């Protein structure tokens, strides 16, 4: 399962997908 990070970089960790 591929997810998109691209607003979560140093504020949070954790990854998600809609």
Same mark, same amino acid.
């Given at each position: 399962? !591929?997810?998109? +990070?691209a607003?979560d970089? +140093?504020?949070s960790?954790?990854?998600?997908? !809609?």
């Open positions: 399962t !591929y997810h998109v +990070d607003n970089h +140093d504020q960790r954790k990854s998600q997908q !809609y």
